[PDB]
Amino acid sequence: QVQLKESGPGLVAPSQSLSITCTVSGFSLNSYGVSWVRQPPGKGLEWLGVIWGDGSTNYHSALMSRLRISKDNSKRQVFLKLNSLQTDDTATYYCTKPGSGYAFAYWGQGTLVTVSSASTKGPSVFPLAPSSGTAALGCLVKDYFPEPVTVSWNSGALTSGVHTFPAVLQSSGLYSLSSVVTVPSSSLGTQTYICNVNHKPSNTKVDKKVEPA
Amino acid sequence: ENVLTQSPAIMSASPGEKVTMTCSASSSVNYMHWYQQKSSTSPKLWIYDTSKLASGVPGRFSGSGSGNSYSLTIRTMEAEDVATYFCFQASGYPLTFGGGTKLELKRTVAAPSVFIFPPSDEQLKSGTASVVCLLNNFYPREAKVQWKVDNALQSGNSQESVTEQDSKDSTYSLSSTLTLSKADYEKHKVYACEVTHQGLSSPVTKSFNRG
Numbered sequence: 388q389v390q391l392k393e394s395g396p397g398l399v400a401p402s403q404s405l406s407i408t409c410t411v412s413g414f415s416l417n418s419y420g421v422s423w424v425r426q427p428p429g430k431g432l433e434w435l436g437v438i439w440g441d442g443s444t445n446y447h448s449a450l451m452s453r454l455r456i457s458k459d460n461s462k463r464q465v466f467l468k469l470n471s472l473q474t475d476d477t478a479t480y481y482c483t484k485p486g487s488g489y490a491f492a493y494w495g496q497g498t499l500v501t502v503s504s505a506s507t508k509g510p511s512v513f514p515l516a517p518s519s520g521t522a523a524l525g526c527l528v529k530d531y532f533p534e535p536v537t538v539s540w541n542s543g544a545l546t547s548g549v550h551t552f553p554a555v556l557q558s559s560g561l562y563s564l565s566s567v568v569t570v571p572s573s574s575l576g577t578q579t580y581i582c583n584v585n586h587k588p589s590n591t592k593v594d595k596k597v598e599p600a
Numbered sequence: 601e602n603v604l605t606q607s608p609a610i611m612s613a614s615p616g617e618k619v620t621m622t623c624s625a626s627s628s629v630n631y632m633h634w635y636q637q638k639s640s641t642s643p644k645l646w647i648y649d650t651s652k653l654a655s656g657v658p659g660r661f662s663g664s665g666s667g668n669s670y671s672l673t674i675r676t677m678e679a680e681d682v683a684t685y686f687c688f689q690a691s692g693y694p695l696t697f698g699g700g701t702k703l704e705l706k707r708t709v710a711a712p713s714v715f716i717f718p719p720s721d722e723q724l725k726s727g728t729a730s731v732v733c734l735l736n737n738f739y740p741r742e743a744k745v746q747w748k749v750d751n752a753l754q755s756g757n758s759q760e761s762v763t764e765q766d767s768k769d770s771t772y773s774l775s776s777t778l779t780l781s782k783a784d785y786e787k788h789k790v791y792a793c794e795v796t797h798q799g800l801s802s803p804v805t806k807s808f809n810r811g
């Protein structure tokens with residue numbers, strides 16, 4: 388089974404360099420090319436470059452030679468190095484394997500890179516308590532930087548009826564979001580509801596139990 | 601470079617309706633490929649070599665074209681087809697993507713369910729009050745949410761967020777968050793959000809009194 392996974396920094400300062408590793412399995416890098424794609428926030432897909440099985444490379448010229456791709460077959464790793472970052476390099480970066488038609492048949496999950504000189508901030512998590520039969524309850528995830536945060540409920544056991552809202556940028560320059568779920572009011576006496584919040588840039592992991600006030 | 605342009609940029613289709621979207625290239629290509637992206641997670645290969653479906657793609661999808669002119673067609677729109685679709689050429693360098701067609705499902709009107717949440721004691725402790733109004737599972741997306749504090753309409757102190765269409769029921773949900781300092785929060789008693797939506801005969805108000 389073909390698999391790719393990116394690992395990179397979430398936050399990098401303007402004029403510094405971006406380094407991302409793509410770790411692969413299920414195919415030999417000696418035999419197959421790996422491309423890189425990015426998606427700026429709210430925008431479309433941009434092809435950045437490729438390293439072929441033979442190690443030859445091709446880059447989008449718009450990058451002004453700031454990009455290099457390299458790889459080490461025995462480590463099963465492909466490396467993106469992008470120099471002299473500016474604000475508009477902020478994007479989700481993907482590695483991908485060309486397959487059928489030379490189109491991108493398998494993709495990594497993507498890693499969000501934000502270009503900013505602002506400090507990393509972990510979120511505070513607060514409950515959105517069910518009111519005193521369908522009940523709504525949730526978590527408010529406040530004042531974090533950069534994106535993203537992930538939210539699950541009961542360690543992934545609760546998915547039906549969950550809505551995790553896109554983050555909003557506050558006037559402070561920090562993000563906030565809420566996650567809510569609707570559940571039967573008759574479950575409130577027997578079922579514990581915990582939101583699990585992760586902010587990887589700050590290594591923040593919060594589990595917040597949400598109960599009637 | 602071979603710039604790819606997609607039309608329309610945004611479209612909506614009724615359930616079961618035929619959908620067609622186009623990709624135009626600035627220079628001729630031998631083959632066009634297409635991806636489906638849902639909620640900004642990894643794109644999925646959908647069609648390759650103009651008309652060949654990727655594994656697992658349902659038969660209601662097809663692709664066609666030649667030269668500079670390509671299209672993607674869905675025989676019958678289904679709720680699971682709500683996504684953004686991107687064309688892509690790999691016939692010459694640089695490899696290029698079109699800007700995307702966002703495809704939406706036009707379903708029936710559904711009124712929101714409305715909930716209001718006061719700030720937690722924990723948050724007040726630290727000096728800030730966030731009051732949250734939730735609009736759950738509604739259609740269409742257009743909704744008006746107004747905050748009133750002691751019956752005075754608020755302005756400039758709230759922000760909204762809206763989900764993508766739900767994968768199965770195709771509705772939206774929306775939050776509106778009112779943010780005040782603890783001090784300003786304690787200058788008032790009644791916090792209310794008023795929701796106007798085409799699914800509701802008249803506006804729906806949810807409120808609480810501090811206490």
Ligand SMILES: CC(=O)N[C@H]1[C@H](O[C@H]2[C@@H](O)[C@@H](CO)O[C@H](O[C@@H]3[C@H](O)[C@@H](O)[C@H](O[C@H]4[C@H](O)[C@@H](O)[C@H](O)O[C@@H]4CO)O[C@@H]3CO)[C@@H]2O)O[C@H](CO)[C@H](O)[C@@H]1O[C@@H]1O[C@H](CO)[C@H](O)[C@H](O[C@]2(C(=O)O)C[C@H](O)[C@@H](NC(C)=O)[C@H]([C@H](O)[C@H](O)CO)O2)[C@H]1O
Pocket residue numbers: 418419420439440441442443444485486487488489490630631649689690691692695
């Ligand atoms: C061969 C070639 O020129 N490759 C180019 C590639 O050209 C394509 C491309 O532009 C597509 C459009 O996207 O159009 C043509 O291809 C047509 C169809 O898309 C395609 O599906 C079809 O495939 C046939 C196949 O050829 C038959 O063998 C098979 O039986 O049936 C299928 C399905 O019908 O062929 C159609 C044309 O007849 C073009 O030919 O374009 C890309 C850019 O997008 C590159 O320019 C490709 O060239 C690569 O160049 C580098 C050097 O810069 C390398 O030489 C690379 O070779 C390797 C590699 O080192 O990575 C050699 C490896 O041995 C090989 N691995 C294996 C297991 O064979 C890999 C591997 O093929 C690739 O990494 C992709 O995973 O390639 C060249 O591929």
